[PDB]
UniProtKB/TrEMBL annotation, chains A, B, C, D, E, F, G, H:
It comes from the Archaea. Coiled coil: none annotated. GO terms for molecular function: L-phosphoserine phosphatase activity; magnesium ion binding. Pathway: Amino-acid biosynthesis; L-serine biosynthesis; L-serine from 3-phospho-D-glycerate: step 3/3. Its cofactor is Mg(2+). SUPFAM superfamilies: HAD-like. The keyword Transport does not apply. This is phosphoserine phosphatase. Keywords: Amino-acid biosynthesis, Hydrolase, Magnesium, Metal-binding, Serine biosynthesis.
Length: 200, 200, 200, 200, 200, 200, 200, 200
């Protein structure tokens, strides 16, 4: 009988934000609510001026109570581009099992849910039709990569990734801005696609 | 309550077949195709008269070419019962993250896809609408459990599980027939629900 | 039969001093004896100006000979506050096994002895009714956390904790003054209670 | 002598039942309730005719509802004998840290709570003064010993221990009946005391 | 396509004898020398009637002094068949790095030296053109596989392999006679080629 | 029977470039093509001004399309010197198994292929008689040394090695320019030979 | 030759009794004291009819009080033979570091104390010139071998060794009687010397 | 039978030079030979101005050829002081197994050979009555401590020790000059004796 021995394949992990999409949930939330503190907390988090979990929970705090519909509607701004799909299809062609990860909400990044072979993000807590908080489903992206510790890992990411994710990977590629731990920096998604297309 | 620290929770792994459903894809394939050899191969696999992967791939071979529609028709025999739903909801109340697994096809077990916190099974290969083979997405259920090695695990399963899976669990419960390595044996899903309801 | 599977629960470790109580044994000893060197050695230890074990043993040296009664009477100044109890009860509610730790004396922190699910501190050596020295019952708080290496750990602490304790934890919260390794800083016990109350 | 480096000492673990006391809670429960099934379940557990946890939880089930007073009355049958006290004091003289363990209830084994340097057993759940179930505070005695994995262990035990516990020990002594994995068998507690007195 | 990330690929290990060739050096040595004891020692080794290394070194002893020319003449009986070449080329197409191993001599198995991506076997010691002994370049085939412990392994082998080698493999295939630890048994090299051709 | 227990021997790893030869493929390529960017990228890589993999792939990019013959002809400039051979023969004399490694092409460093006991370098991809790219056969020299993790390692290297390789070694010797992690610096190959000759 | 890198060498461990000497301390004690029970206990230990430590301590008990002079007189029966010396010297020539071990007394095996590169055995306790007991300086011979876990080990031994010791060895040789776990069996010390002389 | 379970005891490792003795072999060699370079190389080594192995081998180089008698006579300047003996006897009293280590020559430090329970130093190579070189018997003192990794370690040392040794220890005490990694600094041997005398 025919088999695709997927479990034995080198793994390609893609951190979605800043690689596959430029949609940024917290910037959208800042825009929607008019609360600039949201975006400022985001910048403090990205820069390392405050601890990541701290800025994250403060942002969650700032949108507590917002309508579930307003929240879920942000999904309408998320799309899988032909280029994003091209990256993923090509990785499969080149023999990778593809895993998409994000620290944002599965509810919002839903369009990516079946794109790769596995998908993982955080989730949202709704009560009586209002957003209440976040389900933290992995500690950080570094820890999440431990799921694939028995094999090799190519990791691709951008501004929402950090050195913790990259030092778990056997090869790491940053997209658009250098990330400590990454072996390569490519200038944009198109260039990442070109690199992968060159594989074999 | 703006935060569910899901990543830190003890894991409740449920092997779907023989716990949540009595649907058995290969017995159904034997019925539909009339190929008794399929069910015989299953019996040989389950009893350990032949190696499991050997038996599985031989079964896969015997349904090569079967139409995707015939294949997908079987999901009509797969339903989330009130009891199965109560098990999973109660597990969450009792502070578990719930992971549903199977060595059968995700496409057929689709009704369970969103019931737990995580879902994992094998997948099917279709070419021009006809079944070509299996995508093996984990080596075996014990190997899969290594995904949750950093915390504690309660495993529940039935006839499609074995000692390898239960060896990984901190506490294991078999349903309906003793399984080597399980700590406990409950009579049926009802008894299992009652047991979980007694927790804490 | 009903069970609380306590052994499988994520662990909440609380460093008592500066989280649950502001009683500080060595400052009390300085006050009682009039020996300011005691408190100066404490400051040198906390600041890292001298190695921790060194300043500790020097402090022990300075109270050698003090009456066992005078020593044990300091317990009268220690109380479990409603807020401290609230923190611990709420952690249990949210599914944690609670472990209280301190590098101070079990004899003095006795009121906390049965508050959590486990309790660990150092002990005192008395001979002929006088204090002679210290029983060091764990190397440091980092090493002590190894007891719980098979599961997840939330750690909470203040001025008597350090980076060694926090890097062993999966999530760390400092109270009242930043501690390297901690993910979050809350301003006081009340705020820590509020954070935990928000869990699930 | 202002310092006892207890954390560095070899560990003497004593399984309480059948070494320090001949009190057997479940045999007493069978006597008090008249439910012979309780003792039969114990015998089945001890002989391995049924899985240990299966047997334990069935026993727990059979005393659901029993009054806390009836439960606590049994501690009257638990006493620290001169010999048991001599064992523990001599172990300390011989340079061991002493850890007393049991799979029975801390509430009943209270007389031993402060005898050793550390004490660990399971706990009981009472609701409105009536027994509801067991808090399992460690998976089994072997798993518990992992707490002391960084040093050496001498284990002493009797009928309620097994190979799992002794496999963890650097040297194991059984009392009164051979236990798989123990290096030595002594006739009774007196012989054990004599053996320890011969050390160094 | 300016890059083949070979180091990241799943490894296909082939034990040469009984998979790619039916040449058996020791049976040939028995034929050439007329020393039946050589083949008897082989049979005793293969059946486990005597320890493998004991048997191997006894065989080595029995050909001490044999001319290098006689030794090298045997490579004339070793040829890369179209089928053997197809196996290796197809494995590469299917995304494997191919490692050929044998416990026999590299000097005799020279035709296979460049067929795979890596090649490993034992070597011969010649002094003044006469055979003196064996260079053992790995302990056994299982130990050798530790070289590829950081990724996944598909192992293929026949009569000169054993459980030790297959225990190391994530998936193992035996050819022509069942081998303990192999998942699958294929009839002959043709069947093996067909199996690999079915991958992905 | 006589044996050379090679598998049990301490391992001597030699990074070829700058120890055994001063031939530098990328400088030769710069010379041949007239493309100074090649050599500049090399300097940026060696100095750590760009990530190693990044400068490597950029260099590969710059010679894509070059005639396979021009490429392979560079081998004519590579020779095993008497001194290089002396180093290797002496290491064997002193009881080492010798492993030669390089990040350059096996096709070009071919003259060294059978010098040591094992040989490993990267390889070249040719299509229609033109160079297309590189096969990366190990992640870096540090990772490659993991192959020999079960024994002791003496490592010798120069300008194409780095701290990653040396911290895997039990003793490290740099040749001609200091390398972080190296225990010793010798001034040239002759001096390295002298050091090894002094062993035992 | 100003340097012997001894720490890097493969280790040759020799269990003294039954390889280098046929002196058996306990059989001699049985002869001198006339206590047949001593030799019977030895036989029971060697055959595994009783646990080894149990048997050893019972033998130790039976010679309590024996004069140090009587004890030391036995070293007259322990001599380094020309063959034993040749084994050790040849092992060094062949590039091994030589470690001599025994579970018997260093005081009696004193003639071997400086023969190897390292020497380890148990020791005796004398009080006022009379034998009081044994100092157990390692748990068992397998545990002792963990000392050399960072390199390779060739183990040689006879009747006082077991599978535990040989399991630790990369290659094991028994002398005079098969021992579980040994790869090879040689007839006597002469054969062993001849085997080692054949190395490299 | 009586036993001293030495193998189970916490280990006290003493780096001899600068704790037990102020004899400094290389300073004596400088004095004897008049070669000031010897002492300068020593200072460069101690200060970290040159790599330790490098300065060591250069010093060895500078005394190559010196009379074996002149070399061995330096032993006459080495004595076990009452204070040194007091330290060691007291450590045994307080339940430690005592291990003495040095990077100097066993031949010269011979008077310490039987002081502790184990002794380890480097050794000298003599040929035709002249010093030829050094046998390096352990990599460094940190690596040597791995021998005792299964238990706890108290380490004491001075100027010839470094952070590598101390970070392997559970408690570290420096004597006379601070050493990175040490918990405590005592001013001289007398004070170290006083500290140990205070133990229990």
């Amino acid at each position: 009988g025919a088999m695709d021995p997927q479990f034995m394949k080198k793994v390609a992990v893609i951190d979605i934000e800043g690689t596959l999409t430029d949609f940024e949930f917290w910037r959208e939330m800042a825009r929607i609510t008019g609360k600039r503190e949201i975006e400022e907390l985001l910048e403090k988090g990205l820069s390392g001026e405050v601890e990541w979990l701290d800025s994250l929970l403060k942002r969650v705090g700032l949108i507590r109570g917002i309508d579930e519909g307003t929240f879920l509607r942000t999904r309408e701004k998320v799309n899988v581009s032909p280029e994003a799909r091209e990256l993923v299809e090509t990785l499969r062609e080149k023999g990778f099992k593809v895993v998409l990860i994000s620290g944002s909400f599965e509810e919002v990044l839903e369009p990516f849910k079946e794109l790769g072979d596995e998908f993982m993000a955080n989730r949202a807590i709704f009560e009586d039709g209002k957003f209440q908080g976040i389900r933290l489903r992995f500690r950080d992206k570094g820890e999440f990569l431990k799921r694939f510790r028995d094999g090799f890992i190519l990791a691709m990411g951008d501004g929402y990734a950090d050195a913790k994710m990259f030092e778990r990977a056997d090869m790491g590629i940053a997209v658009g801005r250098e990330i400590p731990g990454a072996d390569l920096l490519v200038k944009d998604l198109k260039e990442l696609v070109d690199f992968i297309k060159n594989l074999k």
